[PDB]
Amino acid sequence: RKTPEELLRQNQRALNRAMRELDRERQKLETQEKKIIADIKKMAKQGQMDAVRIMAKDLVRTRRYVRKFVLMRANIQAVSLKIQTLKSNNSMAQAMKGVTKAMGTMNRQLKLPQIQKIMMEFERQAEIMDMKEEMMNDAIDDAMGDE
Amino acid sequence: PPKELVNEWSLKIRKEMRVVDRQIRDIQREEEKVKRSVKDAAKKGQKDVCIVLAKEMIRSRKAVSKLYASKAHMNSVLMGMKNQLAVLRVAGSLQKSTEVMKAMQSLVKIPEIQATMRELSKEMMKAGIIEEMLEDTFESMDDQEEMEEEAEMEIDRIL
């Protein structure tokens, strides 16, 4: 048995190897292409008026193939780019589950009713402060007076 | 094995393309010889036989064109074989990627993550109302329009 992340790393770097070897094949075809233009230029001055046409067809065909070698290089890298975000999604899922559990156990401590009871008790005591103080000042200012 | 046979037959393809190149080279040596013969015929004043010499000039060139077409066609089928090998290997890599894809997605599934969806939604539902209750009870303590105006006046005094 192999752990899931072990297979992921192997697959990713196998994709990298495939990209590298596709690049090597493309480079070989570009060297062959340059050889083709060299031969066409050599034969262009010589002439024949048609062998240049056959080699031009061969050259555009080489370009057509290297087009799609680059295309498969992009295709291979695209699936690696897709699989990169998979572990990010898994990490977000696990961390989100953890923070959800933390928030749940935080909310379970003080629920709706007792926090409201604390609220009413504090508000009533704030009522009491103002009543005592304002009554005191009323009575004492009334007693002093004269101004 | 698919990869093994491709390299073998590709190297044979170039082996035979070089033979075709050798044929072209030999015919071009004869090409130079006949061109020199044409030049010799022209200077002698017998311009009439130079027509037959020119027919000789062009027949060999047609043969050269045929051989070059043969070479290009062999090269084309070689490139096609290499292309098919590349496509097959790309498909194999895609299948290998899909295998680990399924293997690593097998752990987390839709139901147990939708349970967390709803759980976080309800926890935040409660947290928001609790925070709003605390904010409202602390803002109910004294007037806000009265204090907020003194706040800008505080800025002038400090500055």
Side-chain angles (χ1 to χ4, degrees), chain B residues 118-146:
Chain B
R118 285 164 326 119
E119 210 62 26
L120 162 71
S121 296
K122 156 192 85 150
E123 302 325 330
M124 290 298 205
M125 212 56 257
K126 292 181 181 179
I129 72 152
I130 278 165
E131 183 178 1
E132 271 199 330
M133 281 210 286
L134 277 296
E135 268 184 3
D136 290 13
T137 187
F138 273 118
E139 279 190 9
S140 66
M141 269 199 309
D142 291 331
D143 194 4
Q144 313 302 8
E145 186 172 2
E146 182 65 26

Short mmCIF file of all heavy atoms in Angstrom, two decimals, chain B residues 118-146:
data_model
loop_
_atom_site.label_atom_id
_atom_site.label_comp_id
_atom_site.label_asym_id
_atom_site.label_seq_id
_atom_site.Cartn_x
_atom_site.Cartn_y
_atom_site.Cartn_z
N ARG B 118 -22.93 23.23 7.00
CA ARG B 118 -24.05 23.63 7.84
C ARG B 118 -23.59 23.97 9.26
O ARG B 118 -24.11 24.91 9.87
CB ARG B 118 -25.10 22.52 7.87
CG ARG B 118 -25.93 22.42 6.60
CD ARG B 118 -26.67 21.10 6.52
NE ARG B 118 -25.92 20.00 7.12
CZ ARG B 118 -26.34 19.28 8.16
NH1 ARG B 118 -27.49 19.54 8.75
NH2 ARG B 118 -25.58 18.29 8.60
N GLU B 119 -22.64 23.21 9.79
CA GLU B 119 -22.17 23.46 11.15
C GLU B 119 -21.53 24.84 11.26
O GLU B 119 -21.84 25.60 12.19
CB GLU B 119 -21.19 22.37 11.58
CG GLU B 119 -21.19 22.09 13.08
CD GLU B 119 -22.52 21.57 13.59
OE1 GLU B 119 -23.27 20.97 12.79
OE2 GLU B 119 -22.81 21.76 14.79
N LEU B 120 -20.64 25.17 10.33
CA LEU B 120 -20.02 26.49 10.36
C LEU B 120 -21.06 27.58 10.14
O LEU B 120 -21.00 28.64 10.78
CB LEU B 120 -18.91 26.60 9.31
CG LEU B 120 -18.54 28.06 9.02
CD1 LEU B 120 -17.79 28.65 10.21
CD2 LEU B 120 -17.73 28.24 7.76
N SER B 121 -22.01 27.33 9.24
CA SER B 121 -23.06 28.32 9.01
C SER B 121 -23.82 28.62 10.30
O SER B 121 -24.04 29.79 10.63
CB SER B 121 -24.02 27.83 7.93
OG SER B 121 -23.36 27.71 6.69
N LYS B 122 -24.18 27.59 11.06
CA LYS B 122 -24.95 27.81 12.28
C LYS B 122 -24.10 28.43 13.39
O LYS B 122 -24.58 29.27 14.15
CB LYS B 122 -25.59 26.50 12.73
CG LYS B 122 -25.94 26.40 14.21
CD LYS B 122 -26.30 24.97 14.59
CE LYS B 122 -25.08 24.14 14.92
NZ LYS B 122 -25.39 23.08 15.92
N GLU B 123 -22.82 28.02 13.48
CA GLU B 123 -21.94 28.64 14.48
C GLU B 123 -21.77 30.12 14.21
O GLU B 123 -21.81 30.94 15.14
CB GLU B 123 -20.58 27.94 14.50
CG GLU B 123 -20.58 26.43 14.79
CD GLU B 123 -21.64 25.95 15.78
OE1 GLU B 123 -22.05 26.71 16.68
OE2 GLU B 123 -22.06 24.78 15.65
N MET B 124 -21.58 30.51 12.95
CA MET B 124 -21.49 31.93 12.63
C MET B 124 -22.83 32.63 12.80
O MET B 124 -22.86 33.81 13.19
CB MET B 124 -20.95 32.12 11.22
CG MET B 124 -19.49 31.74 11.10
SD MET B 124 -18.46 32.76 12.16
CE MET B 124 -16.89 32.65 11.30
N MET B 125 -23.93 31.93 12.54
CA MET B 125 -25.26 32.48 12.80
C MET B 125 -25.39 32.90 14.25
O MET B 125 -25.87 34.00 14.56
CB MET B 125 -26.32 31.44 12.45
CG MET B 125 -27.65 31.96 11.93
SD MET B 125 -27.51 33.03 10.49
CE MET B 125 -27.73 34.64 11.24
N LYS B 126 -24.96 32.04 15.17
CA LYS B 126 -25.01 32.36 16.59
C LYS B 126 -23.99 33.42 16.99
O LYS B 126 -24.29 34.32 17.79
CB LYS B 126 -24.79 31.10 17.42
CG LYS B 126 -25.92 30.09 17.31
CD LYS B 126 -25.66 28.87 18.17
CE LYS B 126 -26.78 27.86 18.03
NZ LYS B 126 -26.53 26.65 18.86
N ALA B 127 -22.77 33.34 16.44
CA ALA B 127 -21.72 34.28 16.80
C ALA B 127 -22.09 35.70 16.40
O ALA B 127 -21.83 36.65 17.15
CB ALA B 127 -20.40 33.87 16.15
N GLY B 128 -22.68 35.87 15.22
CA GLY B 128 -23.06 37.20 14.77
C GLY B 128 -24.09 37.84 15.68
O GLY B 128 -23.97 39.02 16.03
N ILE B 129 -25.11 37.08 16.09
CA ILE B 129 -26.13 37.65 16.95
C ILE B 129 -25.57 37.95 18.34
O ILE B 129 -25.93 38.95 18.97
CB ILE B 129 -27.38 36.75 17.01
CG1 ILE B 129 -27.12 35.47 17.81
CG2 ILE B 129 -27.85 36.40 15.61
CD1 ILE B 129 -28.36 34.90 18.46
N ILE B 130 -24.67 37.10 18.84
CA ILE B 130 -24.06 37.38 20.14
C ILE B 130 -23.22 38.66 20.08
O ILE B 130 -23.32 39.53 20.96
CB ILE B 130 -23.23 36.18 20.62
CG1 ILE B 130 -24.13 35.13 21.27
CG2 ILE B 130 -22.15 36.62 21.59
CD1 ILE B 130 -23.47 33.78 21.44
N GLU B 131 -22.41 38.80 19.03
CA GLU B 131 -21.59 40.00 18.88
C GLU B 131 -22.47 41.23 18.73
O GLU B 131 -22.17 42.29 19.30
CB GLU B 131 -20.66 39.85 17.68
CG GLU B 131 -19.72 41.02 17.49
CD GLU B 131 -18.78 40.82 16.32
OE1 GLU B 131 -18.88 39.77 15.65
OE2 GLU B 131 -17.94 41.71 16.07
N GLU B 132 -23.56 41.12 17.97
CA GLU B 132 -24.47 42.25 17.82
C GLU B 132 -25.13 42.62 19.14
O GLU B 132 -25.31 43.80 19.42
CB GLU B 132 -25.53 41.93 16.77
CG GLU B 132 -25.12 42.30 15.35
CD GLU B 132 -26.31 42.42 14.42
OE1 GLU B 132 -27.32 41.71 14.64
OE2 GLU B 132 -26.24 43.22 13.46
N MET B 133 -25.49 41.63 19.95
CA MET B 133 -26.08 41.92 21.25
C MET B 133 -25.10 42.66 22.15
O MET B 133 -25.46 43.64 22.82
CB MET B 133 -26.56 40.64 21.93
CG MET B 133 -27.88 40.11 21.40
SD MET B 133 -28.81 39.23 22.67
CE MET B 133 -27.87 37.71 22.76
N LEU B 134 -23.84 42.21 22.18
CA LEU B 134 -22.84 42.91 22.99
C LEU B 134 -22.62 44.33 22.48
O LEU B 134 -22.54 45.28 23.27
CB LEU B 134 -21.53 42.14 23.03
CG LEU B 134 -21.38 41.01 24.05
CD1 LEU B 134 -21.45 41.57 25.46
CD2 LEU B 134 -22.41 39.91 23.88
N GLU B 135 -22.52 44.51 21.16
CA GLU B 135 -22.33 45.84 20.61
C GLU B 135 -23.50 46.75 20.94
O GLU B 135 -23.31 47.91 21.32
CB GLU B 135 -22.12 45.76 19.10
CG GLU B 135 -20.66 45.66 18.68
CD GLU B 135 -20.48 45.69 17.18
OE1 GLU B 135 -21.49 45.84 16.46
OE2 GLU B 135 -19.33 45.56 16.71
N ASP B 136 -24.73 46.23 20.84
CA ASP B 136 -25.91 47.04 21.12
C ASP B 136 -25.99 47.41 22.59
O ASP B 136 -26.33 48.55 22.93
CB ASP B 136 -27.16 46.30 20.67
CG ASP B 136 -27.28 46.21 19.15
OD1 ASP B 136 -26.27 46.49 18.47
OD2 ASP B 136 -28.37 45.85 18.66
N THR B 137 -25.70 46.46 23.49
CA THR B 137 -25.78 46.78 24.91
C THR B 137 -24.68 47.75 25.33
O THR B 137 -24.88 48.53 26.27
CB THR B 137 -25.72 45.52 25.77
OG1 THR B 137 -25.98 45.86 27.13
CG2 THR B 137 -24.35 44.88 25.69
N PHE B 138 -23.52 47.70 24.68
CA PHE B 138 -22.48 48.66 25.03
C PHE B 138 -22.71 50.01 24.39
O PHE B 138 -22.27 51.03 24.93
CB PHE B 138 -21.11 48.09 24.66
CG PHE B 138 -20.51 47.23 25.73
CD1 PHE B 138 -20.24 45.90 25.50
CD2 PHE B 138 -20.23 47.76 26.98
CE1 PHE B 138 -19.69 45.10 26.48
CE2 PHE B 138 -19.69 46.96 27.98
CZ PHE B 138 -19.42 45.64 27.72
N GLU B 139 -23.40 50.06 23.25
CA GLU B 139 -23.75 51.33 22.64
C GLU B 139 -25.01 51.96 23.24
O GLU B 139 -25.25 53.14 23.00
CB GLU B 139 -23.94 51.15 21.13
CG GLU B 139 -22.63 51.16 20.35
CD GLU B 139 -22.85 51.23 18.85
OE1 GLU B 139 -24.00 51.45 18.42
OE2 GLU B 139 -21.86 51.08 18.10
N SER B 140 -25.79 51.20 24.01
CA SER B 140 -26.95 51.74 24.70
C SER B 140 -26.57 52.48 25.97
O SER B 140 -27.46 53.05 26.63
CB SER B 140 -27.93 50.61 25.05
OG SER B 140 -27.37 49.72 25.99
N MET B 141 -25.29 52.49 26.33
CA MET B 141 -24.89 53.04 27.62
C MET B 141 -25.12 54.55 27.68
O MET B 141 -25.77 55.05 28.61
CB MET B 141 -23.42 52.69 27.87
CG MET B 141 -23.22 51.39 28.61
SD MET B 141 -21.58 51.29 29.34
CE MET B 141 -20.61 51.68 27.89
N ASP B 142 -24.65 55.28 26.68
CA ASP B 142 -24.78 56.72 26.62
C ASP B 142 -25.04 57.16 25.18
O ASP B 142 -24.98 56.35 24.24
CB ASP B 142 -23.53 57.44 27.14
CG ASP B 142 -23.34 57.28 28.64
OD1 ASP B 142 -24.35 57.13 29.36
OD2 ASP B 142 -22.18 57.33 29.09
N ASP B 143 -25.34 58.44 25.02
CA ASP B 143 -25.62 59.01 23.71
C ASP B 143 -24.40 58.93 22.80
O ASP B 143 -23.26 59.08 23.25
CB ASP B 143 -26.07 60.46 23.84
CG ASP B 143 -26.71 61.00 22.57
OD1 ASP B 143 -26.86 60.23 21.60
OD2 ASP B 143 -27.04 62.21 22.53
N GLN B 144 -24.65 58.70 21.52
CA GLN B 144 -23.59 58.62 20.52
C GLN B 144 -23.41 59.92 19.75
O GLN B 144 -22.27 60.32 19.50
CB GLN B 144 -23.88 57.48 19.53
CG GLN B 144 -24.28 56.16 20.17
CD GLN B 144 -23.25 55.58 21.15
OE1 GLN B 144 -22.26 56.21 21.51
NE2 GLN B 144 -23.51 54.36 21.59
N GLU B 145 -24.50 60.58 19.38
CA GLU B 145 -24.38 61.86 18.68
C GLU B 145 -23.70 62.89 19.56
O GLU B 145 -22.94 63.74 19.07
CB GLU B 145 -25.76 62.35 18.23
CG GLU B 145 -25.71 63.61 17.36
CD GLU B 145 -27.05 63.98 16.77
OE1 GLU B 145 -28.05 63.28 17.06
OE2 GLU B 145 -27.12 64.96 16.01
N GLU B 146 -23.95 62.84 20.87
CA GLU B 146 -23.29 63.77 21.78
C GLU B 146 -21.79 63.50 21.87
O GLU B 146 -20.98 64.44 21.84
CB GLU B 146 -23.94 63.69 23.16
CG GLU B 146 -23.35 64.65 24.18
CD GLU B 146 -23.58 66.11 23.81
OE1 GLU B 146 -24.55 66.40 23.09
OE2 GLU B 146 -22.78 66.96 24.26
#
